Each structure stands twice: as structure tokens, then as C-alpha cells.
Amino acid sequence: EQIQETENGYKLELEIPSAYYKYIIGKKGETKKRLENETRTLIKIPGHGREGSVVISGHDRQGILSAKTRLDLLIESARRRQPFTHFISIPVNSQPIQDKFIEFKDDVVRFCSGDRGVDDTIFQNPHKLHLTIGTMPLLDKSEIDKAKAVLQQCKEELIAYDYIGHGGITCQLRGLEYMNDDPGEVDVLYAKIQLQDNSDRLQCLADQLVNGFCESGLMNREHDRVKLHVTVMNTLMRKDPDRESFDANNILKLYGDYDFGPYQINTIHLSQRYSTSQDGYYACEDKIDF
Numbered sequence: 001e002q003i004q005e006t007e008n009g010y011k012l013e014l015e016i017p018s019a020y021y022k023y024i025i026g027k028k029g030e031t032k033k034r035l036e037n038e039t040r041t042l043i044k045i046p047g048h049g050r051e052g053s054v055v056i057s058g059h060d061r062q063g064i065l066s067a068k069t070r071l072d073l074l075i076e077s078a079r080r081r082q083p084f085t086h087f088i089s090i091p092v093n094s095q096p097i098q099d100k101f102i103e104f105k106d107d108v109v110r111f112c113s114g115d116r117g118v119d120d121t122i123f124q125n126p127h128k129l130h131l132t133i134g135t136m137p138l139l140d141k142s143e144i145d146k147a148k149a150v151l152q153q154c155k156e157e158l159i160a161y162d163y164i165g166h167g168g169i170t171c172q173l174r175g176l177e178y179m180n181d182d183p184g185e186v187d188v189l190y191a192k193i194q195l196q197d198n199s200d201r202l203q204c205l206a207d208q209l210v211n212g213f214c215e216s217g218l219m220n221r222e223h224d225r226v227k228l229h230v231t232v233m234n235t236l237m238r239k240d241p242d243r244e245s246f247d248a249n250n251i252l253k254l255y256g257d258y259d260f261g262p263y264q265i266n267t268i269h270l271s272q273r274y275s276t277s278q279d280g281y282y283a284c285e286d287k288i289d290f
Contacts, residue, residue: 082137098126117246121239127280155288168266190229
């Protein structure tokens with residue numbers, strides 16, 4: 001995208017997802033009028049249904065560049081507020097893992113039923129056990145395509161850095177953790193991912209994926225580094241009748257070192273939020289395999 005001369009001034013044509021038009025315009029046009037005044041530009045947004053480019057026009061390059069910078073920041077801010085549509089995931093859901101998870105769930109339900117808030121409806125679906133690297137709102141085809149291209153580029157970079165290679169990385173899913181302060185009032189329990197010798201290779205892989213997607217603008221950096229853990233219980237899933245939390249004290253004292261076994265990481269997905277595939281995992285927008 002480069003500014004072009006018009007007969008009497010300059011213009012810049014931009015491809016912006018229409019989901020952001022309402023933020024550029026603002027309430028009764030207040031936001032767009034303000035940007036136009038600050039920069040001495042006009043900002044033309046395609047009418048509804050009418051599809052095309054946002055056009056910044058003005059008499060000088062500097063004002064157009066200033067308007068572009070301000071639109072970029074406005075879109076970035078709006079993106080942080082959009083519901084996520086996709087997420088980068090690493091499945092951790094081989095049959096041995098799932099069998100160990102089912103045994104863990106059955107033990108917790110059998111032996112910790114009497115503990116406040118524990119029931120059989122607050123467990124992850126074993127087919128969906130996964131590590132989440134990060135979420136993204138991908139609000140049109142262009143954004144989905146960009147995310148797929150970033151994922152494929154990340155494959156090459158991860159291999160070049162030796163963060164993964166042929167056949168993938170072996171990990172172990174073992175031990176429970178909670179992130180909140182009080183083990184008697186837990187809403188989410190996770191199982192920890194470890195590597196042999198506590199190697200940091202997977203941490204590096206995860207953080208490099210985040211770097212790639214954040215550099216693209218599609219992902220917002222929320223956490224300092226990826227937490228290498230898998231959700232196993234979450235009370236937001238409860239189906240039976242912090243009133244939502246459970247007392248995890250006995251779960252942790254009885255099963256806190258539970259070993260779900262090893263798992264071979266050989267695929268990383270751009271997963272869709274809402275649909276599922278025939279294997280019972282999240283539907284796969286794209287993947288990289290090792």
C-alpha cells in the first residue's frame with residue numbers, strides 16, 4: 001500500500017475488514033470526523049453492501065500517513081475487544097492420554113463427590129484435550145488467509161530454530177495446578193506439560209508461535225509467556241444445578257501428581273472456536289505437521 005497522486009492531492013487505498021467500519025465511524029460519525037480534522041484528510045468508507053477499499057485522501061503525504069497510523073491504532077484497539085473466532089492449539093489427545101483422563105475423572109467423581117462443588121459435569125471432553133497457544137479474532141477471509149500464511153511460515157522457523165523436528169516432540173502430561181489463590185475455591189484445573197529433563201524446547205516453540213502471530217497484528221500479547229498446561233476441569237461447563245467454584249483440596253492432595261502419560265506432539269492447528277471435526281476435535285482451519 002503506497003500513497004498515489006491525484007490531480008489535486010494524494011490518496012491511499014486500504015483494505016480494512018468491514019467489521020471495523022463501525023469503530024472508524026463512531027457514534028453518529030464522531031470518530032471519523034475527528035480523525036479527518038486532526039489530519040486534514042477525508043476518509044471514505046464503502047457503503048453497506050458496497051464492497052471495496054477505505055480511501056484516505058488529502059493534500060499532503062504526511063497527513064495521510066498520520067491518518068493511516070491513527071486508523072491502525074483504532075483497529076488494533078477494536079481488535080482486542082472482538083470475540084475470538086480461532087485459536088492456535090496443540091492437541092494432546094491420543095487414546096492413551098484420553099484413557100488416563102477418563103480414569104482421572106472417574107476417580108475424582110468416585111472419591112471426591114462429597115467435596116463442595118464437585119460433580120461429573122465440570123470436566124473437559126477427552127477428545128478435546130489441548131494446549132492453547134493463543135486466540136485471535138479473524139473477521140474476514142483476508143484475516144483467515146493471513147493467519148494460515150503465518151502458521152505455515154512458523155513451521156519453517158520452528159524447524160530452523162530446532163524447537164521441533166522430524167516426528168515432533170515427546171511430552172508428558174503430569175500433575176495438576178490451579179492459578180487462583182484459594183484451593184478451596186477453584187474454577188479451572190489444569191494438567192501440566194513437561195518434557196524429559198524439564199527441557200524448555202516446548203516453551204520456546206510456544207513462545208515463538210506467539211511472536212509470529214503477534215508480529216502479524218492478528219494476535220494480541222496478553223500473557224508474558226504461554227502456560228504449558230491443559231484444561232481438565234472448568235466449572236463454566238457445569239450442567240447440573242464464588243457459587244460456581246469447587247473445593248479442590250482433596251483432588252490436589254490425592255491426585256495432584258496424576259500422570260496422564262506421554263504424548264507425541266506432531267501437529268499444531270489453527271482451530272475454529274465453534275465447530276468440531278469427525279475425530280471429535282475442534283475443526284481445523286489449517287495445520288502444520290511434523
